[PDB]
């Protein structure tokens, strides 16, 4: 008989940067 | 052997974006 | 035995907007 499913994989990579902030005053 | 495990969780958030442009 | 580790997860979400820009003219 087969063994159990293996462990979870690792977390994914970081997301991309956010968008530029708003213009200055 | 068993099948592969499930996928990992989503990664961490990305960094803040760059500063905005100058004001008027 | 248990199976191999799963695949990595997906990328995380985008970062927040950046800081405000500098004063203008």
Cα B17 to Cα A14, B10, B13: the distances in Å are: 14, 20, 12
Nearest residue, CB atoms, A5 vs list C2, C12, C20: C2
Which chains are within 8 Å of A by 3+ CB pairs? B, C
**DSSP label at C18?**
-
Cβ of C21: how many Cβ atoms within 10 Å?
A: 18
> What technique was this entry resolved by?
X-ray
Shortest Cα–Cα distance, B24 to chain A (Å)? 7
Roughly how many angstroms between the first and final C-alpha of chain B, as a whole number?
65
Q: With contact defined as beta carbons under 8 Å apart, do C17 and A21 qualify? A: yes
- CA A24 to each of CA A6, A19, B4: distance values in angstroms, whole numbers, following the listed order: 51, 15, 51
Closest chain C residue to B14, measured at CA: C15
Core vs surface per residue C5-18: b (16+ CB within 10 A) or e: bbebbebbebbebb
């Amino acid at each position: 008989p087969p063994g159990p499913p293996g462990p979870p994989g690792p977390p994914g990579p970081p997301g991309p940067p956010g968008p530029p902030g708003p213009p200055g005053p």
